[PDB]
Amino acid sequence: RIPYAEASRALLRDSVLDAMRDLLLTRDWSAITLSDVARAAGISRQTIYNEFGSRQGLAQGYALRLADRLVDNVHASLDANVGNFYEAFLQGFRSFFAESAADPLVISLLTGVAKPDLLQLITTDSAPIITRASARLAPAFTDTWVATTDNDANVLSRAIVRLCLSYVSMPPEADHDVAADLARLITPFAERHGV
């Protein structure tokens, strides 16, 4: 199916940002390096710098790949409850709050101490994680059993990205159940705008 470098890169890559998901799991993202990371994945320094390019590049690199994995859990519950827009979107959001919170970088941004660059990533240059997780999300609405026309379905997903990105930094309050409001908020969007 796919050539050597093509599948040998994506091995290296998922092999680091797996190592990172591992170092980060007992220690905190300020306490971790290219070097501490390289060591843990069993590569050189000079390789992570070529593949990612920096400690920054790894970081965002961590993020993007998380974004992907997160918008993809959606097709899960979309297939789960078919023909029912509320119960689909309920479980889709129930999940996304479950998952995003349990991630080591999330947890290490939230409870860990005052990271400038984690912060700079979720703000000043989010151009990548946002642009990307949008077009990736959009097809859950456009291609699948939830009819949505195309431009209506960018507008929707493009907003659902910017929300989740907010609820990641600033997590829903256990007083009231957020997944639900949000479901009830987009369903009225869903039905008007399908084909």
Ligand X SMILES: CCCCCCCCCCCCCCCC(=O)O
**CA distances (Å), 127 to each of 31, 37, 66, 139, 181, in order?**
26, 26, 15, 20, 27
Cβ within 8 Å of residue 45, ≥6 positions away: 34, 35, 38
Binding residue count for its own copies, defined by CB under 8 A: 41
Q: Which does 147 bind (CB under 5 to 8 A by kind): its own copies, ligand X, none?
A: none
Q: Where does residue 176 rank: exposed (0-12), middle (13-18), buried (19+ CB within 10 A)?
A: exposed
* 92 touches ligand X (CB under 6 A): yes
* 178 touches its own copies (CB under 8 A): yes
Q: Where does residue 193 rank: exposed (0-12), middle (13-18), buried (19+ CB within 10 A)?
A: middle
Q: How far is the CB of 140 from its own copies (least distance, A)?
A: 16
Q: Which does 42 bind (CB under 5 to 8 A by kind): its own copies, ligand X, none?
A: none
- Length of the chain in terms of residues written: 195
- Spell out, one character per residue from 48 to 77, where the chain touches ligand X: x when CB under 6 A holds, - when not: ---------------x--xx--xx--x--x
Footprint of ligand X on 9-48 (CB under 6 A): none
Amino acid identity of 87? E
Residue closer to ligand X, measured from CB, 44 or 131: 131
Residues within the interface to its own copies (CB under 8 A): 109-110, 114, 116, 119-120, 122-127, 130-131, 152, 154-156, 158-159, 162-163, 165-167, 169-171, 173-174, 178, 181-182, 184-186, 188-189, 191-193
